[PDB]
Amino acid sequence: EVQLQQSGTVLARPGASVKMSCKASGYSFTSYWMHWVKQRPGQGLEWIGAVYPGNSDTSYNQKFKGKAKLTAVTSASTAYMELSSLTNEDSAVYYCSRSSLDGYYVKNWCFDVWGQGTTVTVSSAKTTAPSVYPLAPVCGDTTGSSVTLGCLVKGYFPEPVTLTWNSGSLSSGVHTFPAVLQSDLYTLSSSVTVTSSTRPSQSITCNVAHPASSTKVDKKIEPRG
Amino acid sequence: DIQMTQSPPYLAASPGETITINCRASKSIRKYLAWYQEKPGKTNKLLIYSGSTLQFGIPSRFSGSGSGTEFTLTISSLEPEDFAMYYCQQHNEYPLTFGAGTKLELKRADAAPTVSIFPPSSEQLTSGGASVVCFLNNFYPKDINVKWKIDGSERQNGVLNSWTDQDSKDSTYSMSSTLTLTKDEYERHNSYTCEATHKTSTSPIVKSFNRNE
Amino acid sequence: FASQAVAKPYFVFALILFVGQILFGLIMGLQYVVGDFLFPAIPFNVARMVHTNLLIVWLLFGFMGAAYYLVPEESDCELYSPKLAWILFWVFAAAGVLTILGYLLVPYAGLARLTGNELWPTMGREFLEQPTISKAGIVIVALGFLFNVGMTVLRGRKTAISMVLMTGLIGLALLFLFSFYNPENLTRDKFYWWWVVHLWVEGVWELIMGAILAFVLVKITGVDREVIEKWLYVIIAMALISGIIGTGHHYFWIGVPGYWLWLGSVFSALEPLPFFAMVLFAFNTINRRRRDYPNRAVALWAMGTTVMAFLGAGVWGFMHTLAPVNYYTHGTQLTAAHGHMAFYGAYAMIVMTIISYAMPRLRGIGEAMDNRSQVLEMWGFWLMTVAMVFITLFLSAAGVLQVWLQRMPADGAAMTFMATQDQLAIFYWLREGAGVVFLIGLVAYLLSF
Amino acid sequence: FTKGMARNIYFGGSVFFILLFLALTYHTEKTLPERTNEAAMSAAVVRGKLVWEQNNCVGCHTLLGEGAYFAPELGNVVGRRGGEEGFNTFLQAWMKIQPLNVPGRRAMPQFHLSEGQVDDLAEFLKWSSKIDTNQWPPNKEG
Ligand code: HEC
Ligand code: HEM
Ligand code: HEM
Ligand SMILES: [Ca+2]
Ligand SMILES: [Cl-]
Ligand SMILES: [Fe+3]
Structure with a gap:
């Protein structure tokens, strides 16, 4: 059973950093693009970017190019996302999800499994x-x-x-x-x-x-x- | 970027019926559109991808079609667990983009709210605050309006509202409105009203009290 | 003898079908790395069976060619029936083109239906994708041919070269009969499938190759027949002593018993011998020779073959023949790598060798060709040969990387099939390149006359 | 060292090993019923071996490591698609959705096979997966 385990709620001050994790299990972690999607309340989902643990490559939406950093650790089948220069805009739920097809060349596909989401609350x-x-x-x-x-x-x-x-x-x-x-x-x-x-x-x-x-x-x- | 508009943004229906919802792309995504179902306390579920392909394990009551810029999702005969949030995602180009959602609500018979008003508690008063709380419980449909009146005269600010999601037991809605004053503002007036306006009546439901007694 | 001339059709046709085979190669080459190329019109598995059957069919034409040519000289005889040669040439080539068109023109399942594969099911097995009637056709051609060339041998002289080639060809048609035997049990099916593919290619096909080489060495060198034939028998002795029980290297993972892991590895490790002894054979006997042959391309071919065969079948067969090694390498790009260099090195090459020798005199041009037509032929040789070595290089690289990413790590650590294919992409591209250098190479060779 | 002792090592060496080989194939062909679980080799699986052949799966795939190298190894695909219990149902979907139409991706033909045929095909592959291949392949990926 293909499962993604995301890390817990993080609280942060404006201008700080947070780093969240997505722990994969039940499939070949290095074979699938891992995607990250942002959701703020009544705002609809936006695609942040993706890492390919296979060769470590990444792809960012311009909207997020400076805000987010994605990485992966193969040994642990876990992927990681770092958000920086936190503003209030960044308070939101963050999801990881697995491309429903395997391989490096299908970079922009749909996802078959999502994590439950990691809440980031930014506040003074x-x-x-x-x-x-x-x-x-x-x-x-x-x-x-x-x-x-x-x-x-x-x-x-x-x-x-x-x-x-x-x-x-x-x-x-x-x-x-x-x-x-x-x-x-x-x-x-x-x-x-x-x-x-x-x-x-x-x-x-x-x-x-x-x-x-x-x-x-x-x-x-x-x-x- | 290609942008996606979903319609309607919400929709009511009943178990057994057939509904169809829409997803439009700002420009041609060819055949590459997917839909997800979102439910509380469950991870998001892929339903169809590439416009028309059922994903493994999904009941065939679901189906979808379209190409270019116009797409639809259809549910043949609604089932209780189908009332949920539905998102579409374009899988043609970088960067990936989503529709803002369609909420498929369970339809029920109209129900008028139960309205109850509460004066500031003794404790809250002695700390300098006065919060007047009004509950509007178990109504349907969801659209409702609250007016606060203080001694006959409307009250615009200090007011804060919260709504529940559609109850999964009885399918209704609830709402709380809290009018927050200072002990001092509060004691300088007498009667506090909370008025609810809901389709189940032309005349509002009105709950009130006089601070004195 | 004036009935050696019936070899020409078989040689010409073999070369025609060889151009096809290569073209269908290049298609698959491109499909690897552009997955939808020619889809749906020509799916990968269709291009493959065309690439694959043309290779086998054209080699079979080269073999009958070779036999028709050298046998009369050896028997010191006119060929028993020069007409039956000419009629059995049209039956074979008809049935050849026909079955290739079957593949392209009808969806494979339809072709099974159309040809009545229902009644007697033999289709959809690797190298055996030809309908049951297509196969029947090949047996009648083969039986007419065996009778024809065998009668020639029976009257007039027995030479070691004669007998061995005959034993080789009889062995080829006989083992082909198992291609009509298709058990409902998968393992039993696989077990017997190798009785065709392996006992051909590391078995009876080695006697056909040995005797053809051995004949060409007799004529282009002038060295004593007594010594050539003595060497020949050594070569084939070693071939079968290792080969027969060597079938066992295909018997590791199909579900036959474990003792084959032992038997198969040990006997296989000696299978390089014949090929190395064939190197020594050709080098040593081209080394001490009576005459200077006016065709210097034949001597190239003869040597290149023993070398290529050795590298391809010998060295590359050896890399993966050992059970603990094959366990990881089984059914990978390593396999396609070995498959190519061995088929080209031993068989394409041996065929091109005998055509180099016999075509000039088959057209009445004489012993050799004008020095302008010889320099192309060797440009042809080197390009093909060197393109192929690069092909197998690129593929071994893709292979090791595949075993690395796919076969070696644990569940969850190992890449999925499609994912690891993506990593192999550059090797697949370079292989197409190498394939293009090879086509150009073939064209060069064909234009050398 | 004459041509004669060579020719004789050829003959006897050969005729010896052919006999030793038939002997081993006899012994081996007695072993199969239990090795391959032939009792469980039903009409369905046999009917599936037919679908597999008629459509030339082998022309893109490998079965127990033999076939084409264009697509995944199907001897153990069961273990990659929700196991024993759900596989037939998967295969039904899998066969109907082809080709997937992802640009650039190796593509699988639509074979238009009946529900019945895909069900036999599924039994074939399940059976195939439970043959004792002396622990091949190395892992879940084939
Ligand atoms: C090439 C022309 C193919 C032929 C013929 C067959 N298959 Fe195939 N198959 C092919 C590809 C390129 C893929 C992967 C495609 C992708 O985008 O992932 C597949 C996959 C399968 C699978 C899934 C294997 C897995 O590892 O999950 C199965 C079960 C499958 N194919 C079955 C199958 C059958 C039964 C065939 C004969 C009827 C057959 N395939 C032919 C390519 C090709
Ligand atoms: C003599 C000419 C040879 C030819 C033309 C040849 C050809 C091939 C081909 C085409 C294959 C792939 C078979 C398939 O489709 O599954 C193959 C596989 C194999 N060959 Fe050979 N071969 C030759 C000699 C040899 C020799 C001498 C050895 C031993 C040193 C050898 C060892 C192997 C082994 C072990 C495999 C199995 C590959 C696997 O498990 O994936 N081959 N050969
Ligand atoms: C010229 C460029 C060539 C290309 C691009 C090419 C390509 C291929 C491809 C892609 C396959 C199938 C791979 C798979 O099964 O997944 C194949 C099979 C094969 N080809 Fe070629 N080929 C070429 C030339 C040749 C030549 C000259 C020969 C001569 C012997 C040859 C012999 C074979 C053999 C024996 C197989 C069987 C596959 C196996 O069992 O391993 N090929 N070829
Ligand atoms: Ca093969
Ligand atoms: Cl072999
Ligand atoms: Fe072999």
Whole structure:
């Protein structure tokens, strides 16, 4: 089974360098062009360039000619990409993929296997733990069959954050929204809907974990008055 | 460079139906066009290459044709796992170039959002901040509009929105809107409204509260 | 004897088909490095079977030529039936051209169908791509020929040269019968396939070559027949003592038992001997001679052949004949390299040698040609010969590089077939070059009369 | 050293080794049924050896290292195309998509073979791959 293993998320400051890897397995690594494709959110894919581990040759899109450096190490069946003079534009997901045909002369073909992607986040931000606020329905009144609660996780960096209700025991009726940037920092929210009988009667706690700052906080949703 | 335009950019359909999507090249790529399927938590999958060739292992419900500058992908009878993102790539010339995508969404019956409003928490207030949060849950179709009103009067900025992708269980959508003020801006007003506008009604859904009580 | 003249058609035709063979070579040459060249019209495997069958067919014409010429002299006889020579010339050449047109004109599977390969399937085996009727044709031609030239031998004199050539030709047609025997078992098929290809080429074809050389050495030198024939028998003795069990070097990887690895390598390592003894044969007996032959091209040919054969069959056969070495080299550009220098060195060359000797007197021009026609012939010689050595050089290079990149490293470390072919590209180009220098070389030679 | 002792070494040396060779071919032709797994050599594989011959695969490919050197070794292609279980299905696709039409690339003919024929062809090649070739080829690449 032909597989490509890419390295993990990297964070960097503007004007820095990062170097990511793509570990090949289950085919003859020196026989296939390895291609690298960039994807920024709602931007569509662009082809960065390719290395041919067979003879070490490379080919760059002009758009990237100075930004990217590709190399390979045959012994380890791994290919490598280096990005330099990092700007914000460079924050994106980066994929490696294998030409679906073998050989040096098919330089521009389609790909049959992709890696899962390596996220590069470029930022001047500093690691900052989230503030976690519990969100409880407009001052406690007799309402419908359903009740909705929320949890606001505010002002952190970098991503990700993991959130759960009741340590994972409440799984459905949850919506956890994508984080979004406010200035340097991310913020995120999650809502849970539950039968009106269930709470305040029973107990609902929002569980937030932000591994970058080694925080874990729990906020119990507390009826207003 | 040769550039690629995909159309439509998104498309709704139902299991069982047939859909067809488009890919145009700024100049002749001859027969060399490929399509990939993108799904969350799965690596991208080659479907067809050279315009019309099924790649190994792909169900024959998929097919594609075209030459020169105009191409299509077709799915004979849609299957649940076919709702996904579809990209085309030209494999005629250096440098390789991709279309920007077509999103094939699972169609469902219209659903109005459930709207819920939340005042700033006690904790947030005591740190100087005030975030008013509004959820708009489980609606379809995806287009929706949120207005914040403070004491009757629209509120343009301090507002931040987030959307979920189409839920894979019930096929609906969700959205959160957060209006962030300072404790001071917040206490200088009384009523906070969040208004949702969605095709399921001509009149907006309106949730509000008065800061006093 | 005035019925030696029936050799001319066979010689002319052999040279006609030889020009073809080369042309179809050059096509394949180009296809290596331009993969779609002449596609779909003429796929690689079609150009190949044409290149491949013409080589074999034209050599067979040269062989019948040689036999028709030298046999009457040796028997001290008129050739049994000079008409049957002339009629069996048209049957063979017809069936030749016809089967070559079969290949080009109909998709191969269609040709199997068209010729009723269904009933008696013999097609689609290497060197044996000719339909079952095409083969039948070649047997009748061969049987008429054996009878014809054999009757001549039976009445009038037995010479060592006569007998050996005969034994060679009988051996050729007999072993050709296995080309009608096509087992459903792959290994059994392969096992018997070599009874044709190898026992021809390192077996009975060596007696045809030995006796032809031995005859030419008799006439152009004047050295005693007693000594020439004595040497001859030594040559063929060594050929078969090593050759017979030497078949084993094709028996390593087809799925016959392991003891062939031992048997095959040991017996093969002695297979260079006949060819080296043929070098000594020609050098030593051209060395001490009674007369100065008015045709100095024959002596060139005679020597070049033993040298080329030795290098090609001898040295190049030896490089890869050893089981632990062939294991890595089996079915690679090394193989095409050896295949070429040995076929050209021993067989093309031996044929051109006897044509050099016998054509002048076959046309009534005399012993030799005008000194203007001799200098072309040797320009012809050298170009072909030297082009070929370059060809095999380039190919061995492609070969070692192939074994290097493809065969030696472990799973995952080794290059894929297509990938490694891309690396070989420059060698494939230089080989085309060398092939062009060879065509030019052939043309030169043909124009030398 | 006469012409006679030469002629006799020729005769006897020859007639000795022909007999020793027939002896070894007899011994070898008894060995095959188990070496090649003839019991598993079915009508399908035999019907495939026919497709292989009729279409001259050998004119571009090598089978167990013998044939043309223009295209890959097919004795062990099974191991390069998702193995035993999926090979027949692969070969169906593989035969139908030819020629691939990549500019400059060595090209494979369209043979227009029926589903049935490609299935026999696939059995042929699977069988071929499981012959004991004394560990040939060196690796997965042929
Ligand atoms: C030359 C005119 C060919 C003939 C005749 C046949 N094949 Fe072929 N084959 C050829 C090429 C140039 C290639 C590789 C092309 C590429 O772009 O990769 C192939 C490949 C195959 C394969 C795949 C081998 C691999 O290593 O993956 C198979 C299984 C195959 N061919 C089968 C095959 C059969 C069954 C044939 C007779 C019907 C046949 N080929 C003929 C070139 C040529
Ligand atoms: C005498 C004239 C010879 C000719 C015309 C000749 C020709 C050839 C040809 C055409 C092939 C390729 C066969 C094929 O299509 O598979 C071949 C292969 C081979 N030859 Fe010869 N050969 C000659 C002599 C010899 C000799 C003397 C030796 C031993 C020293 C030898 C050893 C080999 C071996 C071991 C192979 C197998 C190649 C492989 O495994 O890929 N040959 N020869
Ligand atoms: C003149 C230029 C020539 C070219 C470009 C050429 C090319 C080729 C090619 C490409 C092949 C097939 C390779 C493959 O199977 O993949 C081949 C086969 C062969 N050619 Fe030639 N050839 C030339 C001349 C000759 C000559 C003069 C001879 C005379 C003996 C010769 C003898 C053979 C033989 C025996 C094979 C069999 C292949 C084998 O079994 O290894 N060729 N040739
Ligand atoms: Ca061969
Ligand atoms: Cl041989
Ligand atoms: Fe041999």
